[PDB]
Write a protein that binds this ligand. Structure first.
Ligand SMILES: [Zn+2]
Lengths: 50, 106, 248, 69, 93, 93
RNA sequence: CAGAUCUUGGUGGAAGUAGCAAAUAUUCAAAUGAGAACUUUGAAGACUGAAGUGGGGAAAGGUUCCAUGUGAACAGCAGUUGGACAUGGGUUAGUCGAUCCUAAGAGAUAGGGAAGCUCCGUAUGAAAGUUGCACGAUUUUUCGUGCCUCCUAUCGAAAGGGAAUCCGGUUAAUAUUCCGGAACCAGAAGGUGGAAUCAACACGGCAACGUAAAUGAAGUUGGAGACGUCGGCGGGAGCCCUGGGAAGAGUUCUCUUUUCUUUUUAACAAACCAUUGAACUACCCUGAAAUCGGUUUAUCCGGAGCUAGGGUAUGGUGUUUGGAAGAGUUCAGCGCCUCAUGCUGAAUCCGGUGCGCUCUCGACGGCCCUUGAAAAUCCAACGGAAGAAUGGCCUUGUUUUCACAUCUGGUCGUACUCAUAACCGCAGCAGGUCUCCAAGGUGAACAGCCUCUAGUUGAUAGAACAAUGUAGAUAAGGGAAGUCGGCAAAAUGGAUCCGUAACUUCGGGAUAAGGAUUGGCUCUAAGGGUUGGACAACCAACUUAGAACUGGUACGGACAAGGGGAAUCUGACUGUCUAAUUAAAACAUAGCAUUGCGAUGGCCAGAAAGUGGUGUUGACGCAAUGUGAUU
């Protein structure tokens, strides 16, 4: 609410960083099945719950 | 007409959210947040405000010089002139009667 | 069943509202000055205590041991005024507003804020318009017989202190409240005890009086004194019931 | 901002340590304002006559940096 | 104009609360809002406050009297003061 | 339209939706009249046309709703002064 | 395995079916694009109509904010577009908040219970020390004793208290934070200047009291912080309204010296301040008042000293200035790729008004069996601890509560939405969610209606009006004959002038019931302000009442906006409840009556407790009941 604690802001920074696309060269590794995942979080679909 | 908004994140009409409408040198009507009015010190014996002392917030008195917070008289800045006069007369009369009672007790 | 309202009044939301109250109305600590001579204080304030009908008196005394002044909270006696000099001690004069031992006062005097024991700082006759009458004395094993506002006769040691006069506030209960609003405002600054729901208007789970196709108790409202909590409702250990057609 | 009434005090303030600079302002009504920028305050002196303004400018200390607006 | 026959100050209560209760409140309200003489000043400038506080207006005798809920002095207090004075005068000798 | 209303148009009973007190309070009308009457009385007292004995009486009548306007007050003052002067002439002669 | 309204998964008929219909509404042209009803631009028509579909915040969300691209999934139609997708960028504080203080409360410690998890307990049955004082101390000073006095853990408010910042400009996105200018506060040393003291701590005024300073330790006392609600009155600021001048723009068959926009001045600093507007508001001096006087809209004051005269204080959102025209705004030109988007001309002026709106201030009044926080912090007083400059002149300390000057002010938050799409409700849901500002006209009005600023034109679209629907209207004659029942609808409705019954607790009933008028235009009379020599030419004003004339015999012309009466049962009344089928005669209420209890107590609580509530209480009190105004 524009009035956030330091811990809350760091958690928001971590959440925004986690919600990023996975590079293709990562999926290209031999024997890897990291191509797609459902961990993508949108600000309107799934809430962070603090 | 121009409509104004609070200059701070406090969005309620509290006693700490006193505002005054001002007109700037840009033809802009906007709020100006102001503090509460000061209070004149009161007499310790009668409770009346003390003459010759400005009305200021409690910490605003620290910036004043000594003479501006005091009246040049005994108990000046703590008691009114009438209260001081009554105390002087009462003290003198009671001491005189105490002397009379002591002398007459023999 | 269910825990009744009387059992639920053990605290919490049923505590007294004491934010606006100014302090306890204790007389003073029984010290050397009051035990042997007298001490002079000046009534500097007569104020209103929220939740109390009688006014309170702020009286400033002089500390006999340290360079200091002590402010007391006497129960205001009718006729007292700010700037009055009150005297507390054994050698104090029989004047309204002074605090004297009960054994140093004649028979038939009207007093207030009377101590049950010497040093408890006032127990008897503190509500507005109430007073205690000194009935008699007994020098051997010094004890004073007094008459309480309820008509009871109590024997106290002849060293308990009392204030000469009557508690200020006059007759307050003579005026009808005249509406629930006045009753609401009266008990708002006292506690959470108003309004009151009748037991017969409840369900059997809530109160012993609840239930039935008609609002009725169904059993004698007079309950024994040795009744367990939860059933000690109605008239507890009633000696007699009905209109008090002649009593003394 | 403070205003100076007498010219003497204006020269005295100019003859100090905090007198970093001065500014000359010419108004539409042929009024001249002499402003001294000190450490805490800006001191302004108003001269309504050109002759007195010229004499004041000539009497200003040489070490003072005077700038026209 | 008389403007009212019976209710007087009570007329603010309308037709509710009962006539007898309204009259009983009326008498006490008149006592509560009546002026009284200051025994130390003499002016009829004594007003009630908080049902027991009585203050005198003016530049003099700014004292506060502890009285009754609706009157400055009640009969019980007057009788108590009289008997206390009699007991004191008979015990001094 | 405002100019027409200033002349006196669009004012009749068919153009009024609020009560007379709502459109113009009687309290304000009485306040204006009392201030005007008291100002006139003070001016006459300062100018010496009336004395303090007559000024006090006229002040009480003005508070008592005796004079409808300035003309009524002036007429009453004129009659009082004329009667006082005539009685003074009779006493002197 | 054929079943178990079996389990999991997948997939059918219904079926291209129900449906995608609340919130007035869109149209033309151009651009882009393969593709345009949804994108953008221009034009037109409309809506929200300031209690907004406007501009901000609190909670909540967390990057949704901005720029550039994409149109696979979502945006129940579409998509060139999006709060979607992808890549980058963006939140700058001594002055705004948190941080500091305390409230309701939470909670260690001492101590006591409990098998124990843990419970009670917050100066409590504690050896609970932070502070006051020169004794050593060269010689001009915070370092080891001694004697000491009711101190004390902390957490707890982004709406309580509180040290201090304003203007203009700047970004794609931040600003009271950045830039330019101009200030303020706190802390630290003492860098200067000033003041008093020749032999220690100033003067003036009768006084209220005033000053550029005007030495003050412990201890104590006082004040500020610091306070309810309602009503009227007076003032100020902003807004609104109105008369001229200037600049630009709109209309111009005709008329309109016309209509519209701008005409601005912050924090801070100085001097006055009842003058210009608002207190003889409080106090002081002279003086002594009845033929009592003064005085508010409101009846308060005065030998406890009125009126009157003269002073002292309270002082800004008041006046004159500085800031500050150098800013901002409007208009008119030059270059003409123009580069720093520069340079050059003018105006930004003079007046007025108020039962007007919002905020605020001042003096008052009414009400309480309701009297309407605490603390941090700051200031003042009583008091007298301590001082040493010397040679009437070359020589010190104090003040740093006097003026100028120096240094420092750390950490965290700062984007954006705040909602008919950024929160919750499974969602981009007609629901719910605290609060700030609030133009003109009509009108009593924050009512309804239209409009200005601002915002939006977003709710899948096209064609046609079948039955039956939903919502809105009308209807000859009768007028409740319908129906359990006047359900629904209709009728009444504003204002002014007449008139108003039974009954009653005398307060009401009551707007009882029942009648008349209402437009426009032209006048008449009365009711108030300053002001030039009985008066007076203006300027600046709003009401009321009446008359004539006139037309649709019409006029609260839309909107807005009581149907009324006669009885019975019941509850006295105001109020409260079954969130999501029952709002009532149910509950509560004031009133009435009864019961227990004088503290070694009544009632309640706890496993126990050196335990808690009533109780900051004491019979006019607390606790437990029944009945339910008055008579
Ligand atoms: Zn008196």
């Amino acid at each position: 609410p524009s009035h956030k604690s330091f811990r809350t802001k760091q958690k928001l920074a971590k959440a925004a960083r986690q919600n990023r696309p996975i590079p293709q060269w990562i999926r290209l590794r031999t024997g890897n099945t990291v191509h797609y995942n459902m961990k993508r979080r949108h600000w309107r679909r799934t809430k962070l719950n603090i | 007409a121009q409509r104004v908004t609070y200059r701070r994140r406090l969005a309620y009409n509290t006693r700490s959210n006193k505002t005054r409408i001002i007109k700037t040198p840009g033809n802009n009507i906007r709020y100006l947040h102001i503090k509460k009015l000061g209070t004149i010190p009161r007499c310790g014996d009668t409770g009346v405000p003390l003459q010759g002392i400005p009305a200021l917030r409690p910490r605003e008195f620290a910036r004043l010089s000594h003479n501006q917070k005091k009246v040049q008289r005994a108990y000046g800045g703590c008691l009114s002139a009438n209260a001081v006069k009554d105390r002087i007369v009462r003290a003198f009369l009671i001491e005189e009667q105490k002397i009379v009672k002591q002398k007459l007790k023999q | 069943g269910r825990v009744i309202r009387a059992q639920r009044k053990s605290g919490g939301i049923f505590q007294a509202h004491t934010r606006l109250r100014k302090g306890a109305a204790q007389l003073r600590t029984l010290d050397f000055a009051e035990r042997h001579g007298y001490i002079r204080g000046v009534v500097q304030k007569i104020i209103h205590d929220p939740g109390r009908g009688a006014p309170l008196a702020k009286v400033a005394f002089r500390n006999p041991y340290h360079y200091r002044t002590d402010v007391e909270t006497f129960v205001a006696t009718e006729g007292m005024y700010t700037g009055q000099f009150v005297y507390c001690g054994k050698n104090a004069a029989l004047t309204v507003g002074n605090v004297l031992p009960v054994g140093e006062m004649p028979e038939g005097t009207i007093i207030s804020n009377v101590e049950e024991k010497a040093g408890d700082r006032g127990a008897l006759g503190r509500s507005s318009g109430n007073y205690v009458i000194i009935v008699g004395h007994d020098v051997d094993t010094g004890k004073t017989r007094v008459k309480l506002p309820s008509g009871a006769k109590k024997v106290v040691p002849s060293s308990a202190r009392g204030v000469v006069g009557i508690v200020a506030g006059g007759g307050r209960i003579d005026k009808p409240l005249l509406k629930a609003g006045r009753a609401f405002h009266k008990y708002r600054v006292k506690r959470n005890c108003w309004p009151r729901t009748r037991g017969v208007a409840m369900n059997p789970v809530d109160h012993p009086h609840g239930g039935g196709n008609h609002q009725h108790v169904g059993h004698s409202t007079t309950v024994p004194r040795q009744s367990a909590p939860g059933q000690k409702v109605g008239l507890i250990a009633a000696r007699r019931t009905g209109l008090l057609r002649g009593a003394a | 901002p403070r205003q100076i009434s007498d010219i003497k005090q204006f020269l005295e303030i100019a003859r100090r340590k905090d007198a970093t600079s001065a500014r000359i302002k010419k108004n539409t009504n042929k009024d001249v304002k002499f402003k001294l920028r000190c450490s805490k305050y800006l001191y302004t002196l108003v001269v309504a006559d050109a002759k007195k303004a010229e004499k004041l400018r000539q009497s200003l200390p040489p070490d003072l940096t005077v700038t026209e607006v | 104009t008389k403007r009212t026959k019976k209710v007087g100050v009570t007329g603010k209560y309308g037709v509710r609360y009962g006539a007898s209760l309204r009259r009983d409140v009326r008498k006490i309200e008149v006592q509560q809002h009546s002026r009284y003489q200051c025994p130390f000043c003499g002016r009829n400038t004594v007003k009630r406050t908080a049902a027991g506080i009585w203050c005198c207006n003016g530049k003099g005798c700014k004292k506060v009297l502890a009285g009754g809920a609706w009157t400055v002095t009640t009969a019980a207090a007057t009788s108590a003061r009289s008997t206390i004075r009699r007991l004191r005068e008979m015990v001094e000798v | 339209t405002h100019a027409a209303k200033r002349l006196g148009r669009h004012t009749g009973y068919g153009k009024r939706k609020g009560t007379a007190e709502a459109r113009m309070p009687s309290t304000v009308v009485w306040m204006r009249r009392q201030r005007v009457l008291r100002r006139l009385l003070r001016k006459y007292r300062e100018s010496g046309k009336i004395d303090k004995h007559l000024y006090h009486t006229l002040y009480l009548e003005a508070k008592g709703n005796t004079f409808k306007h300035k003309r009524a007050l002036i007429e009453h003052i004129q009659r009082a002064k004329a009667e006082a002067n005539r009685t003074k002439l009779i006493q002197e002669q």
